[PDB]
């Protein structure tokens, strides 16, 4: 069972992946889903990539996140090489060797956002709300559509995530309508990339009294 998406590839490079996929009989799609087993990132020679939605969702699903060099080197050697040898080591934002992709694959029985309830509040850009909500679900969070539906239950802890630069403002007034902590979206992305629930401290959005 295999199914791939690609990220950061040129059309010419995609075309080689398809040929590769076809020789080895691997399903290749445009969109990542629960069915997806492999995420092929464009990388440099040290297996460092850029952060894309597929990158985040590949890690969140505990999928294989491997260098495009996996494909090209396999083509040259005329056999399917070990995913383990081409796994992404890190990314250009959070560190060239954080090993987020390996950690997540091995850590699906102890998810970083387990026991949290998360609301993706207000506008977001370059990333639809439903994909952000989906990301944190894969990482174990409960999704809340509206601030007033946060569980008052000690069973789950609530967190509000917002992207301030999408606003035009009101995101300093969320703390007047509930007591849940308000952090930027970068808290999620960094948490997912590192596959480590980050301290809120550096991500907190100060609220108006």
């Amino acid at each position: 069972r295999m199914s791939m998406v690609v990220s950061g590839l040129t059309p010419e490079e995609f075309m080689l992946v398809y040929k590769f996929a076809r020789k080895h009989h691997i399903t290749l799609t445009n969109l990542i889903t629960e069915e997806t087993t492999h995420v092929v990132m464009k990388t440099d020679a040290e297996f460092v990539c850029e952060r894309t939605l597929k990158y985040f969702l590949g890690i969140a699903g505990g999928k294989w996140v491997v260098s495009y060099f996996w494909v090209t080197q396999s083509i040259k050697e005329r056999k399917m090489l070990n995913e383990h040898d081409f796994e992404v080591r890190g990314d250009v934002v959070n560190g060239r060797n954080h090993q987020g992709p390996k950690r997540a694959r091995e850590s699906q029985d102890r998810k970083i956002f387990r026991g949290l309830e998360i609301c993706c509040y207000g506008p977001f850009t370059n990333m639809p709300t439903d994909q952000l909500e989906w990301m944190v679900q894969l990482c174990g969070a409960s999704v809340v559509k509206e601030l007033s539906s946060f569980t008052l239950g000690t069973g789950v802890h609530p967190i509000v995530v917002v992207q301030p630069d999408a606003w035009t403002n009101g995101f300093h007034a969320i703390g007047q309508m509930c007591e849940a902590p308000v952090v930027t979206r970068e808290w999620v992305l960094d948490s997912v990339a590192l596959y480590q629930c980050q301290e809120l401290d550096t991500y907190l959005i100060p609220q108006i009294p």
Binding site: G8, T10, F14, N126
Partner: peptide, 12 residues
């Protein structure tokens, strides 16, 4: 029809 102009999240 597949996407190519994926957005890259570089803090900012």
């Amino acid at each position: 029809t597949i996407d190519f102009d994926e957005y890259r999240f570089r803090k900012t």
